Design an enzyme around this catalytic site. Sequence first.
Site, short mmCIF file in Angstrom:
data_model
loop_
_atom_site.label_atom_id
_atom_site.label_comp_id
_atom_site.label_asym_id
_atom_site.label_seq_id
_atom_site.Cartn_x
_atom_site.Cartn_y
_atom_site.Cartn_z
N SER A 96 8.20 -8.09 4.01
CA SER A 96 7.69 -9.08 4.93
C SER A 96 8.83 -9.81 5.62
CB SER A 96 6.79 -10.08 4.20
OG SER A 96 6.41 -11.15 5.05
N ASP A 108 -7.34 0.33 -7.14
CA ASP A 108 -6.08 -0.35 -7.46
C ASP A 108 -4.92 0.39 -6.80
OD1 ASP A 108 -3.96 -1.73 -8.54
OD2 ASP A 108 -4.29 -1.05 -10.60
N1 LIG Z 1 -2.42 -3.68 -9.83
C1 LIG Z 1 -1.65 -2.86 -10.73
C2 LIG Z 1 -0.31 -3.51 -11.07
C3 LIG Z 1 -0.25 -4.53 -12.01
C4 LIG Z 1 0.97 -5.12 -12.32
C5 LIG Z 1 2.12 -4.70 -11.68
C6 LIG Z 1 3.47 -5.33 -12.00
F1 LIG Z 1 3.30 -6.44 -12.78
F2 LIG Z 1 4.24 -4.42 -12.68
F3 LIG Z 1 4.10 -5.67 -10.84
C7 LIG Z 1 2.06 -3.68 -10.74
C8 LIG Z 1 0.84 -3.09 -10.43
N1 LIG Z 2 -4.07 -4.79 -11.92
C1 LIG Z 2 -4.94 -3.87 -12.62
C2 LIG Z 2 -5.98 -4.68 -13.40
C3 LIG Z 2 -7.21 -4.94 -12.84
C4 LIG Z 2 -8.15 -5.67 -13.55
C5 LIG Z 2 -7.84 -6.14 -14.82
C6 LIG Z 2 -8.87 -6.95 -15.60
F1 LIG Z 2 -9.52 -7.80 -14.74
F2 LIG Z 2 -9.78 -6.11 -16.17
F3 LIG Z 2 -8.24 -7.68 -16.57
C7 LIG Z 2 -6.60 -5.88 -15.37
C8 LIG Z 2 -5.66 -5.15 -14.67
#
Ligand SMILES: NCc1ccc(C(F)(F)F)cc1
Ligand SMILES: NCc1ccc(C(F)(F)F)cc1
Length: 330
Positions: A199, A35
């Site tokens: 972008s 992530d």
């Molecule tokens: N994949 C992690 C993640 C999930 C949500 C956000 C948000 F909503 F804060 F932009 C940032 C990063």
């Molecule tokens: N962006 C981070 C994240 C990744 C996967 C999930 C899930 F799929 F487990 F819900 C939640 C949040």
Amino acid sequence: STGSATTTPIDSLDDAYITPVQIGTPAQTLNLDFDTGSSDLWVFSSETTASEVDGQTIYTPSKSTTAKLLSGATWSISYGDGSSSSGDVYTDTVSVGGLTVTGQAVESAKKVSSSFTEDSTIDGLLGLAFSTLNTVSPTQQKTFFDNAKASLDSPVFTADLGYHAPGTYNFGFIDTTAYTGSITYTAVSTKQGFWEWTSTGYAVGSGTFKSTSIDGIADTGTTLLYLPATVVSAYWAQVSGAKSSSSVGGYVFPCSATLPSFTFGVGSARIVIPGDYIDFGPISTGSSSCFGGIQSSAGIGINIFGDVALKAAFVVFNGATTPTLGFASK
Ligand SMILES: NCc1ccc(C(F)(F)F)cc1
Ligand SMILES: NCc1ccc(C(F)(F)F)cc1
């Protein structure tokens, strides 16, 4: 040194990608969601509430000769979807595709939200944003990438996500056989802790390219593409019968329609997302309404270049002292 690992979609919709990671001595292999939108390495463990575990592989620090409890440290995280988890912190050896880091903070989940419990294929997350977002208290901890940076041949990692197919995460080197043409690099702002970039515009299908600045984050941990309401309206206006549904919570379209491609700008370069990548299938089993992979960011507060966009490109995460993002067609 370098590391290389295969990442695999968890289901037929590419909802997420899991990558095997070795933790502890002897190795305990867990399948983690890499992530770039967060900065915590947390895992299901023997400390997780028993009712909150449904098929996941758990990390057992008591069986690892290298695990050390980080005395007094706790962690708590909430994701943009409302997901959450919390627990205590160990340090252990962590290896990704041959690349080993000793003394990596491994955050043992004591409590996890339901969204994680129901996902039996994901044993945890490996955060790859900048370490300023790490939630360990009172001593903030570094990410796997930050701890490996000094030993890497080059302070980069690359994401090569597959469309309905396995992909590759590489650490420390750029595979010049994995992309076509040149890599276009663009500046990154770390002020919010994200891989944030700008972008240069977009186009829908074979239409005219609209030059406009779209600030957003490169997030392997988010499934869809979240863009401003004006851009998303212009895309779905080209799909017969498409509409925003409040009950579904997003744009839906008749499953019989064909979707146009979506182009986004990286400097002077263009990355083309095939229309098939935007189809996320029926909103329920048997339904003739299908869910769209391009959605509005208005409710979120930030634009997100998730897997839908990233899997159309070879993406370089350059963690040099001045960080940059590289995009290349493949
Ligand atoms: N994949 C992690 C993640 C999930 C949500 C956000 C948000 F909503 F804060 F932009 C940032 C990063
Ligand atoms: N962006 C981070 C994240 C990744 C996967 C999930 C899930 F799929 F487990 F819900 C939640 C949040």
